[PDB]
């Protein structure tokens, strides 16, 4: 890996974030990027619920 | 564990949830068993018994009923016979209903038998390779009738009543002490 790494850098001046399958007849996804998004969306939803726990009013915008 | 939940999807929500038994043994919900539905696996700090009941402590919200019945005695004709919502006790009597009860919930006197545990059984492999100082003397039972065992005369009658009594007295004395 390193010898390729020097080769790339001298021309210019992390393959573990991609899950790849076997071509039976290739990159399949993004575990790091997908999990971050799926984890944050439930975080803002959890943030929303804790705001809504103890409220009855709310600005009723019908515009 | 069984009968806590109804389907594996329910167990999914409560994985890792804290649990305990009646005895006080704490535990955790590990994972949901694929078969049968609802059954799950839990690991307890010490071995639990079948007779135990495993309990999960949860909290369910309760809401305050919005009931407002101002007393307006002056508007009435009598002014001293205002009557609003009746008590649960009175309501049941008017409808001829029993106070709900659960046979499980009632209390009863509990009598505990003295607890006793079996004697210790050393594995034979360990027992074989023991130092000479500490070798456990396990005296095997005899099955072939010994000749002396077929010879000895046991006094009957007057001695028998006079010997059972000795085993009677000494049993009282040790228990007294």
């Amino acid at each position: 890996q390193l010898k390729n790494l020097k080769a790339a850098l001298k021309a210019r001046g992390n393959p573990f974030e991609i899950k790849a399958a076997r071509n039976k007849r290739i990159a399949v996804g993004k575990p790091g990027i997908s999990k971050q998004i799926g984890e944050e969306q439930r975080k803002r939803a959890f943030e929303a619920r804790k705001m809504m726990k103890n409220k009855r009013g709310g600005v009723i915008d019908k515009r | 564990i069984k009968d806590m939940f109804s389907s594996a999807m329910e167990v999914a929500r409560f994985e890792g949830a804290q649990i305990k038994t009646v005895s006080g043994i704490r535990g955790e919900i590990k994972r949901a068993l694929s078969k049968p539905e609802g059954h799950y696996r839990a690991a307890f700090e010490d071995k639990i018994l079948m007779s135990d009941i495993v309990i999960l402590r949860s909290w369910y919200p309760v809401r305050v009923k919005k009931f407002y019945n101002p007393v307006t005695s002056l508007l009435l004709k009598e002014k001293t016979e205002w009557k609003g919502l009746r008590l649960t006790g009175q309501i049941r009597a008017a409808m001829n209903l029993e106070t709900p009860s659960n046979p499980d919930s009632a209390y009863h006197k509990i009598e505990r038998v003295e607890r006793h545990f079996n004697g210790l059984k050393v594995p034979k492999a360990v027992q074989k390779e023991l130092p000479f100082k500490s070798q456990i003397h396990q005296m095997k039972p005899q099955k072939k009738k010994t000749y002396m065992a077929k010879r000895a005369v046991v006094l009957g009658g007057d001695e028998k009543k006079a010997r059972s009594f000795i085993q009677k007295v000494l049993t009282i004395s040790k228990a007294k002490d």
Binding site: - | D46, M50, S51
Partner: protein, 49 residues
């Protein structure tokens, strides 16, 4: 007993085994557990010796 009502020092009665589970036997409480644990630890200690 200083500044304590006799109502505070009220006996809390102990529950019993459910009838649906009556076959299995007596419901183990904390006291009867402690006896089970102590005896087991006493025996294992001798084996380790």
């Amino acid at each position: 007993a200083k500044l304590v009502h006799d109502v505070q020092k009220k006996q809390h009665r102990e529950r019993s085994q459910l009838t649906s589970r009556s076959r299995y036997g007596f419901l183990e409480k904390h006291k009867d557990y402690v006896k089970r644990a102590q005896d087991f630890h006493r025996k294992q200690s001798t084996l380790k010796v």
